[PDB]
Curated annotation (Swiss-Prot), chain A:
High-level lineage: Eukaryota, Fungi, Dikarya, Ascomycota, Saccharomycotina
Designated name of the protein: ATP synthase subunit alpha, mitochondrial
Organism of this sequence: Saccharomyces cerevisiae (strain ATCC 204508 / S288c) (Baker's yeast)
Chain positions found as Phosphoserine: S20, S141
Entry-linked HAMAP family: ATP_synth_alpha_bact (MF_01346)
Localization in the cell: Mitochondrion inner membrane
Family stated for the protein in its record: Belongs to the ATPase alpha/beta chains family.
Gene: ATP1
Transit peptide is among the record's keywords: yes
Swiss-Prot record, chain B:
One BP annotation, GO: proton motive force-driven ATP synthesis
Protein known as: ATP synthase subunit 5, mitochondrial
Coiled coil: none
GO annotation, cellular component aspect: mitochondrial inner membrane; mitochondrion; proton-transporting ATP synthase complex
Annotated InterPro entries: ATP_synth_OSCP/delta_N_sf, ATPase_OSCP/d_CS, ATPase_OSCP/dsu
Molecular function GO terms recorded: proton-transporting ATP synthase activity, rotational mechanism
Family (UniProt): Belongs to the ATPase delta chain family.
Assembly and interaction partners: F-type ATPases have 2 components, CF(1) - the catalytic core - and CF(0) - the membrane proton channel. CF(1) has five subunits: alpha(3), beta(3), gamma(1), delta(1), epsilon(1). CF(0) has three main subunits: a, b and c.
Species assigned in the record: Saccharomyces cerevisiae (strain ATCC 204508 / S288c)
One Pfam assignment: OSCP
Gene designation per UniProt: ATP5
Other comment: Present with 32400 molecules/cell in log phase SD medium.
Swiss-Prot record, chain C:
Protein name: ATP synthase subunit beta, mitochondrial
Pfam families: ATP-synt_ab, ATP-synt_ab_N, ATP-synt_VA_C
GO biological process terms on file: proton motive force-driven ATP synthesis; proton motive force-driven mitochondrial ATP synthesis
Annotated ATP binding sites: G151, G152, A153, G154, V155, G156, K157, T158
Coiled-coil positions: none
PROSITE patterns per record: ATPASE_ALPHA_BETA
Entry EC no(s): 7.1.2.2
Other comments on record: Present with 164000 molecules/cell in log phase SD medium.
Residues recorded as bearing Phosphoserine in the entry: S334
Length: 505, 187, 469
């Protein structure tokens, strides 16, 4: 006829034997059938929705399905630990994770257990994992700088603080490095006394080898930068429900900084592995497969995660928390449900081409499929002026090379000469972050066509020599770009003159 | 768990009832009260057969229970809690089903075989007795298990006789012999 | 009235209540469950028997203690509408979330309403022009019409719509509604700011705009009834104020998507892909409440975030049914660098005709379509064997088509921020002349690059002088 959870013979036997089990089922439960990393518990009638429960196995779970007579907890933990008819006690609180200031230079897991084991986490509070996005009214436009040290990603992609900006590209191109370079570049920003010049960068590692992350941590401490950055970890080892809760928890920690008004940044690497995790969880919850077998609430998950990163209003102290979610594109095909969903949410994407990567640019920023919907201003005015038209130029090189494969018009050839020469200038090797002051003249040179004086072979020589030359000839110009942050007509002329001077030699 | 496992679906209620009242050792009492309420089911045929139909509310269902226990107070007490369960679970179609299941389960706990000697004719009482004697004589009855034996008339059994009890049958039929004949005299 | 219930289940934000009292709220009633954090408005969607309804919860469920008292607030949720909704940004509930304080509600109107009748239709045909050349040539709009846009949203998709707001709504005198379902909060903040700046919303004095904003953060169920909420405000303008309205919806894929999620939870077995079985009816009802009636003809702009550009996914397909014009926007054409990124063989309007917009316009468009179709047809052939190795007559056509494609590139006003190129809005009469000339190869004596990202024919000529330098 029908199957009801009370039909379970031991439960059924208590009801027959008089009735119930003395109101023990309002705040403690006893586990019923269990497996598939979800448990069905009898009682816990005072359970709050999305409460954290602690099982006597030590495993803690988030109530997901509140059903008449039974609750379907999701086990943040391994199955072997949990056993049937175990007594579940209510934590009594909605899932919260400790948040505070003393997570800078800490590796924690998703439960906030310090897996760096640099003692207990110094956390002011705990804050609920899910928190609503700031509305239209608490939002405020971005204008703060985020300089990545990668000229392309800092002259074709303007990034500022409190934004939502996608970083997308191909599997195991050491995808991480672009972000690592940003963290390094804003070392001197983060050596800045002003804490609106300090970023607190959170690296959420989802679905990555526990070994690889440990190498990264050591790398970060070699590059002396761990102390201004947080690492949240949800490794490959870590259980799929933990992985599901990992980005949300990380964003709570960031929000404590954000809600100090202080400027932060968070990199969620890789949400594609969250998609697989949510898929696993959903399928094991027997929720009907969505497209590409990825659940239908995957859009909801990502959108809730992403939209909690913001540049708050003046009232809220201009609470920056930049978001850079790192998507591992399926075969480099941006048509694909998970990538497209992210693209629509984010403002700007930074697609990278394998062909260019292979063709010796590490990093190799495809600019056909990199856009930044951050638009004009979010980076230094000097780097708006000099950067002027370069997006056009490299999409004129793109156009030129579209039809390059018959006869060439002098206009196309001139562009090809600029394009190729510009491409050499673009090239940057990993762990070479470039100062803002340094980026202005290089871009000036190419834009003002003074880079035709250099041949492709000698572009690299020109770059290093030019920077050394500028400093030796007059570091005054660069100091002006350092403080003024703008090129006065005199400074601009002086720079034109200076560029011409070096170009000549 | 208490003797004789029944894998009844909605018979899980009967199983539960059995073990629950076995552990309270009020099984004979249960069986008797169950007979009495079962009797009052048969003796309530209008709206006690014709309102075993699912259309009752929670509140209206409860009031059907209340009318039944007004009719008699001979109830196990555990089966009054079971009555509550059946009202709440709105188990009413498999209500006499549960009664039958508990009865079988109970009288199995007491020990009592069942049996039938389906035949193509209604055999003699002399036959019933002679066969019953024979069956008790055969090691099939080992005692602690009694017997019911009903010879039934079924035209379907063509040839022989068929004895059935304890999931052990001797099935004499004409059909199997006919079958062998047919097959070989066509091949 | 106080009609109690308890929350038996909370399977997502599709709570099930058991109204203890046999007095059972009817379907499409609204219920208030009181909570320490505000209240929750839930809407009865099924009666599952034994006085246990299953209710959509329009707010994000959490904290719920199993068995929570309910009170029945009855009927379809009645939003508050008015001239004092103009300026306001309103929550799904109707709460002014831009905190211009409470709406002085004249009429509070039910969320659910029925589309006007076949006889009540007043079928328009009045041309609405934008000044966007590609739009004008290929699929000219009509005021009161139903306009449609497809492809990846916020791929400048949002920007395209913003350009439409900039052009069309700064040429529309009546009211205008922007309703953004799953809107990007920063973009919304910018838009609100821009609107306030351009006086379209003016905090003091009247606003000829009203706003509904639905963030994609907000749970699916809330997003489902964002559309209906906006649609009610639109009805107040259409009917009660009478006045013709603009309407923007961005994106209605989010409406469909939300529906598919809740359908599963409701218990409805999911139809193909996963979509709600009631997809067609709901879309139909909604898009016929934006219809052209004797009481008002409401210009609608519908934006579909086509998922992975699967138009074959039934929801975009069924959008075409409820449209009179479409302007499917192609990612490929975006890759080709064209802004507007409009697919040129996948735009249509019924307004395009040889007498509706005249024979000359129609002939020009016909030739453009044919020329481009040839060029696309020979794309394989060209690549394997050069266009040099293809016919001379065709080679002229190919070169011409490359020019035409570039000619269609036109900068835009609020694209000016992103592109960095000052916008161009070119008169429709001018457009026909300009394209006609190009087709007659009059100006096909100058570079292909000249035609790229510029407005009128005169601009191309001037840019030839620029290129020459």
């Amino acid at each position: 006829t029908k199957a009801q959870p009370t039909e379970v013979s031991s439960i059924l036997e208590e009801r027959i034997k008089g009735v119930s089990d003395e109101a023990n089922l309002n705040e403690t439960g006893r586990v019923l059938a269990v497996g598939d990393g979800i448990a069905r518990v009898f009682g816990l009638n005072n359970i709050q929705a999305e409460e954290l429960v602690e099982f006597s196995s030590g495993v803690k779970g988030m109530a997901l399905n509140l059903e008449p007579g039974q609750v379907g907890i999701v086990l943040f933990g391994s199955d072997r630990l949990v056993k049937e008819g175990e007594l579940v006690k209510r934590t009594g609180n909605i899932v919260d994770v400790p948040v505070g200031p003393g997570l800078l230079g800490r590796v924690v897991d998703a439960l906030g257990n310090p897996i760096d084991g640099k003692g207990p986490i110094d956390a002011a509070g705990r804050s609920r994992a899910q928190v609503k996005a700031p509305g239209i009214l608490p939002r405020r436009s971005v204008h703060e700088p985020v300089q990545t040290g990668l000229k392309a990603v800092d002259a074709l992609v303007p990034i500022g603080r409190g934004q939502r900006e996608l970083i997308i590209g191909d599997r195991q191109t050491g995808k991480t490095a672009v972000a690592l370079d940003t963290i390094l570049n804003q070392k001197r920003w983060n050596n800045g006394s002003d804490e609106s010049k300090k970023l607190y960068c959170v690296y959420v590692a989802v679905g990555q080898k526990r070994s690889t992350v440990a190498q990264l941590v050591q790398t970060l401490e070699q590059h002396d930068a761990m102390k201004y950055s947080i690492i949240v970890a949800a490794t490959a080892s870590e259980a799929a429900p933990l992985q599901y809760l990992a980005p949300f928890t990380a964003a709570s920690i960031g929000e404590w900084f954000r809600d100090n008004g202080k400027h932060a940044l968070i990199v969620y690497d890789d949400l594609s592995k969250q998609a697989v995790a949510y898929r696993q969880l959903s399928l094991l919850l027997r929720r009907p497969p969505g497209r590409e077998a990825y659940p239908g609430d995957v859009f909801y998950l990502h959108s809730r995660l992403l939209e909690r990163a913001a540049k708050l209003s003046e009232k809220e102290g201009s609470g920056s928390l930049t978001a850079l979610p790192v998507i591992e594109t399926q075969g480099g095909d941006v048509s694909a449900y998970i990538p497209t969903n992210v693209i629509s949410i984010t403002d700007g994407q930074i697609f990278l081409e394998a062909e260019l990567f292979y063709k010796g640019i590490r990093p190799a920023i495809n600019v056909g499929l990199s856009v930044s919907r951050v638009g004009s201003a979010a980076q230094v005015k000097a780097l708006k002026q000099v950067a002027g038209s370069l997006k056009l130029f490299l999409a004129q090189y793109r156009e030129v090379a579209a039809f390059a494969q018959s006869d060439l018009d002098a206009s196309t050839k001139q562009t090809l000469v600029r394009g190729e020469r510009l491409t050499q200038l673009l090239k940057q090797n990993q762990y070479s972050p470039l100062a803002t002051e340094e980026q202005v003249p290089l871009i000036y040179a190419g834009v003002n066509g003074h880079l035709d004086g250099i041949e492709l072979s000698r572009i690299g020589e020109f770059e290093s020599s030019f920077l050394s030359y500028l400093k030796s000839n007059h570091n005054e110009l660069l100091t002006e770009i350092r403080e003024k942050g703008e090129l006065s007509k005199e400074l601009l002329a002086s720079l034109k003159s200076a560029t011409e001077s070096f170009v000549a030699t | 768990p208490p003797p004789v496992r029944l894998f009844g679906v909605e018979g899980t209620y009967a199983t539960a009832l059995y073990q629950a009242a076995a552990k309270n050792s009020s099984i004979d009492a249960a069986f008797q009260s169950l007979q009495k309420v079962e009797s009052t089911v048969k003796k309530n045929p209008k709206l006690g057969h014709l309102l075993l139909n699912p259309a009752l509310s929670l509140k209206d269902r409860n009031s059907v229970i209340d009318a039944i226990v007004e009719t008699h107070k001979n109830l196990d007490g555990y089966v009054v809690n079971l009555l509550k369960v059946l009202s709440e679970n709105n188990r009413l179609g498999c209500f006499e089903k549960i009664a039958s299941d508990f009865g079988v389960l109970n009288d199995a706990h007491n020990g009592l075989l069942k049996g039938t000697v389906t035949s193509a004719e209604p055999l003699d009482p002399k036959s019933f007795k002679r066969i019953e004697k024979a069956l008790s004589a055969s090691k099939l009855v080992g005692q602690g298990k009694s017997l019911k034996l009903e010879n039934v008339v079924k035209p379907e059994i063509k040839g022989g006789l068929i004895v059935e009890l304890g999931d052990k049958t001797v099935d004499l039929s004409i059909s199997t012999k006919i079958q062998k004949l047919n097959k070989v005299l066509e091949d | 009235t106080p009609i109690t219930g308890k929350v038996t289940a909370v399977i997502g934000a599709i709570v099930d209540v058991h109204f203890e009292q046999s007095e059972l709220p009817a379907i499409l009633n609204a219920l208030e469950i009181k909570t320490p954090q505000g209240k929750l408005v839930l809407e009865v969607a099924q009666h599952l028997g034994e006085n246990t309804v299953r209710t959509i919860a329009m707010d994000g469920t959490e904290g719920l203690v199993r068995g929570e008292k309910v009170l029945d607030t009855g009927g379809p949720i009645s939003v508050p509408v008015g001239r004092e909704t103009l300026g306001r940004i309103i929550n799904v509930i109707g709460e002014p979330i831009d905190e211009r304080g409470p709406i002085k509600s004249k009429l509070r109107k039910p969320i659910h309403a029925d589309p006007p009748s076949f006889a009540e239709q007043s079928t328009s045909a009045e041309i609405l022009e934008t000044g966007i050349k590609v739009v004008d040539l290929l699929a000219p709009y009509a005021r009161g019409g139903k306009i449609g846009l497809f492809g990846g949203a916020g791929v400048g998709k949002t920007v395209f719509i913003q350009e439409l707001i900039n052009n069309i709504a700064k040429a529309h005198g009546g009211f205008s509604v922007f309703t953004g379902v799953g809107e990007r909060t920063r973009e919304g903040n910018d838009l609100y700011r821009e609107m306030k700046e351009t006086g379209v919303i003016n905090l003091e004095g009247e606003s000829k705009v009203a706003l509904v904003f639905g963030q994609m953060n907000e749970p699916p169920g809330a997003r489902a009834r964002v559309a209906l909420t906006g649609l009610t405000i639109a009805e107040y303008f259409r009917d009660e104020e009478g006045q013709d309205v603009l309407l923007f919806i961005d994106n209605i894929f989010r409406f469909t998507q939300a529906g598919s999620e809740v359908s599963a939870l409701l218990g409805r077995i999911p139809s193909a892909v996963g979509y709600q079985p009631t997809l067609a009816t709901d879309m139909g009802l909604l898009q016929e409440r934006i219809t052209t009636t004797k009481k008002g003809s409401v210009t609608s702009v519908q934006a579909v975030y086509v998922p992975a550009d699967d138009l074959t996914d039934p929801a975009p397909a069924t959008t075409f049914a409820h449209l009179d014009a479409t302007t499917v926007l192609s990612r490929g054409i975006s890759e080709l660098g064209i802004y507007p990124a409009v697919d040129p063989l996948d735009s249509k309007s019924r307004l395009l005709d040889a007498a509706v917009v005249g024979q000359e316009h129609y002939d020009v468009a016909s030739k453009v379509q044919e020329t481009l179709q040839t060029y696309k047809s020979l794309q394989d052939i060209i690549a394997i064997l050069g266009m040099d190795e293809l016919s001379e007559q065709d080679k002229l056509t190919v070169e011409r088509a490359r020019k035409i494609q570039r000619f269609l590139s036109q900068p835009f006003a609020v694209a000016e921020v992103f592109t960095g190129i000052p916008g161009k809005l070119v008169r429709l009469k001018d457009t026909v002349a300009s394209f006609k000339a190009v087709l007659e190869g009059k100006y096909d004596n100058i570079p292909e690059h000249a035609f790229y990202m510029v407005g009128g024919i005169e601009d191309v000529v001037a840019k030839a002088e620029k290129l020459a330098a």
